[PDB]
Ligand binder design. Structure first.
Ligand code: HEM
Ligand SMILES: OCc1cnc2cc[nH]c2c1
Length: 289
């Protein structure tokens, strides 16, 4: 399976910056969502989940085809809650109907990260919608109740190494878990992209408790939580070193996250040698908007 990026006809940087701006303006407008967290975190999760179906072995899944729009993937139990992100993007797609679904979902994640004061994430266009029969089966996204070995093995399927995994997981600084979505509850309400996930792991007093869904999670006195898979990053000595690294260097985390997140969003895509360079979008703040 080869998926070749094909630029939406006649479109260039300015077109996608307009889409970015529309997403960013709506992020600012619809600020009440999820107890005033806003839609930032769920858009980041959406971009990750539409990418995280990828399988390096046969190039099935991945962001390219925009298959989350199809019921099988939309209704994946692993994707519970992401419907809110999709609904958010509906008026954006209506205003810019020329953008492909994969481009829109991935761009949503990039926009959210940047607007939440995270690192720049270079982004490339050219994902092309593929038919309903290309939708990957449910079950390719990760379980949260497992250990470091599970996480390591899981991410090998996405061609991610230890540093890439630990960097990507830093997105768990954002938003929260919702009992009705995933069987986990809590996490606060952060919508600013920082390295705080690593600081929280290292600095908080964690207790292994059971939540109201009878699942174990790690809770701190201060009211934070970590999934078992989050906490596994300080149980494994190789992950732990990297956690400490990012806890002590905000810039290094930003740079590594940016690389890993772009890679995640681009897995499975062949870019022609003469494709445009990756775009780096200006934030609303940078534009004075
Ligand atoms: C082992 C890997 C991972 C596991 C098991 C996992 C699991 C989860 C679970 C269970 C939730 C709560 C969903 C809910 O109840 O609403 C969540 C939330 C979230 N995840 Fe992950 N995740 C993983 C990796 C990632 C990665 C790689 C990213 C992005 C780079 C990411 C981004 C997010 C974000 C932003 C939220 C908050 C969503 C919201 O506030 O609505 N996660 N994750
Ligand atoms: O409490 C911190 C926190 C916030 N959000 C998430 C998402 C997964 N694990 C998390 C942990």
């Amino acid at each position: 399976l080869v998926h070749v990026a094909s630029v939406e006809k006649g479109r260039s940087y300015e077109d996608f910056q307009k889409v970015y701006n529309a997403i960013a303006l709506k992020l600012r407008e619809d600020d009440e969502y999820d107890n005033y967290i806003g839609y930032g975190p769920v858009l980041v999760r959406l971009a990750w989940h539409i990418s995280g179906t990828w399988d390096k072995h046969d190039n099935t899944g991945g962001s390219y085809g925009g298959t989350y729009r199809f019921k099988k993937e939309f209704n994946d139990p692993s994707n519970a809650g992401l419907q809110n992100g999709f609904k958010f993007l509906e008026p954006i797609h209506k205003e810019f109907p020329w953008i492909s679904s994969g481009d829109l979902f991935s761009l949503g994640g990039v926009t959210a990260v940047q607007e939440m004061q995270g690192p720049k994430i270079p982004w490339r266009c050219g994902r092309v919608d593929t038919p309903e029969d290309t939708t990957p089966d449910n079950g390719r996204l990760p379980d949260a109740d497992k250990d470091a070995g599970y996480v390591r093995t899981f991410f090998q399927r996405l061609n991610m190494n230890d540093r890439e995994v630990v960097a990507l997981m830093g997105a768990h600084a954002l938003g929260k878990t919702h009992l009705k979505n995933s069987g986990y509850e809590g996490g606060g309400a952060n919508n600013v992209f920082t390295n705080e996930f690593y600081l929280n792991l290292l600095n908080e007093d964690w207790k292994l408790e059971k939540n109201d869904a009878n699942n174990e999670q790690w809770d701190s006195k201060s009211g934070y939580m970590m999934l078992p898979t989050d906490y596994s990053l300080i149980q494994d000595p190789k992950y732990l070193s990297i956690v400490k690294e990012y806890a002590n260097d905000q810039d290094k985390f930003f740079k590594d996250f940016s690389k890993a997140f772009e890679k995640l969003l681009e897995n499975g895509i062949t870019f022609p040698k003469d494709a445009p360079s990756p775009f780096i979008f200006k934030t609303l703040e940078e534009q004075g908007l």
